[model samples]
Target: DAGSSATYPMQCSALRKNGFVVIKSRPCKIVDMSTSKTGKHGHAKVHLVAIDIFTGKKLEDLSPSTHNMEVPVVKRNEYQLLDIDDGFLSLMNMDGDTKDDVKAPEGELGDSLQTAFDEGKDLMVTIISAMGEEAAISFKEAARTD
Candidate 1:
């Protein structure tokens, strides 16, 4: 009731591979889907296998084909990598606005970000946000205009 809605309903039969859906109340991407032959007593059961976008966790859900499934409104945004302090990132948007809420994640993505920035390369970081959470997933050198 306080926060905005993170997901909306869509018929289970409409889901497809590579599409976003809510599995275990987390935003995930559909990896597989199977529909068992319709039984005499009920509608087809749609079984879905999905991977959590943020955590990479596997999740599964089963529902009737006619039932409504929750679909997350996943979003990916690009920003200029300005700085890092205490493992937190300083990101600048297109309008010259800055935010330091996202952190440098552990492992390769975080390492590469530091490496490129240390080399003084103008770079951009991609932030993926869903279900009121955000993370830096990837980055690349900023493209030259002139």
Candidate 2:
């Protein structure tokens, strides 16, 4: 399960809030969590509050502490900025065989990229994927940090 697949099952008790989990077979990030036990004969109930990783919908689940929960195997794929035309930024992967285009949205990433570009610094970017859904995550100057 740890080789190349994008997901796996994990014990419900091992998960922490703000981490990624699989609920209803979809990749989700746990936003809130709590525990309670209704009786001395029963295990603690683990309640999770989550959101769809790609869809941004609320997700919730309840289970015993010993229950199983699926988790997405996330990957950080690297890409290089090739060109920017309008709001679409052309990119190429580390292998150079794969190319992609992503929109330059209004955010810190966008600003950092534009600033690095104007300053003529080498930029390396990372795109994160969980269960096959992907999003650009970060960009750093290749001058100092590795």
Candidate 3:
């Protein structure tokens, strides 16, 4: 889904043990970007909101000049849902190299499993499938005592 029509190319590089390798013909899609003009003596800067086609996460970067940046293409990996327990969602790659079990920030899950199960009644247990990957979850201030 292209949330916003904003699109731009970005320089893509990978860090290696020896040095960084710049990919020549790759470019990334900059979606939902916002540009702001500088005030007074500040230099004009563009704030980029982008996502790599390979990974489905959103990223942010700044550029003083937004012209002709190289974009890198990456291979996509499949992540399968494994389980969810005690407010934690576990996901493993199809190749099984990455295994991540994430819990909503403490107190962020609110009523915990019950809330998700009840309010998400329309989806049944399938709601958990979107757990670590979607914006339906909310974040709250954590309680702390000294």
Candidate 4:
């Protein structure tokens, strides 16, 4: 789970809110942080509350403050939205490369995308990727639209 993956090591003491980290092998963003010290015998412990990036799940974890934890390398890439067929998206990048592997996420975002596309609006899909997985998380009006 650690070799050449989309994650890196970060000491617990250095983690902060809104930062991307791994919680139970899922990529998440830190939402809460609290540290407490036990009586003379125990190392300082850090309690974390992170929200899963793609799943909307909350995770709680406790770890020693001095130890290292895995942090996800999350990236946001915007691609020109070309088409939507079935549950997948047809996307084009800056170099005009086409991609259609990512799926249209379920919920408001997906609904909004379908509506916008049907209305013939030029748009770009924002893909948030982590741990070799990616999703269509958001969208924005494409620049220089004709």
Tens-digit lDDT string for candidate 3 (1-146) = 43422223443221212211112322334565445666445445555556433233555655554344444333232344344545454443436643445443233343554454444331211111221232123322223466
For 1-146, candidate 4 gives per-residue lDDT tens digits of: 44567678999878999998898889988999999996367678889899999987899889888879899987888888887877478887888767858886476887888898889987888888888878888788955737
Cα distance off (Å), candidate 2, residue 42? 2.5
TM-score against truth, every candidate: 0.91, 0.69, 0.28, 0.91
TM-score-better candidate, 1 vs 2: 1
Q: Please estimate how well model 1 matches the true structure, expressed as its whole-model Cα lDDT.
A: 0.84
With candidate 4 superimposed using the best TM-score fit, by how many Å does residue 48's alpha carbon deviate from the native? 0.9
lDDT of each: 0.84, 0.75, 0.37, 0.84
**Model 4 CA deviation exceeding 4 Å by range:** 1-4, 39-42
Clashes of each: 0, 0, 4, 0
lDDT of the structure predicted as candidate 3: 0.37
RMSD from true fold, candidate 4: 2.0
State the TM-score for model 4.
0.91
**lDDT (0-100) at residue 41 of candidate 4?**
71
Model 2 agreement with the true structure over 77-111: per-residue lDDT tens digits: 77777666564666766777545555643467678
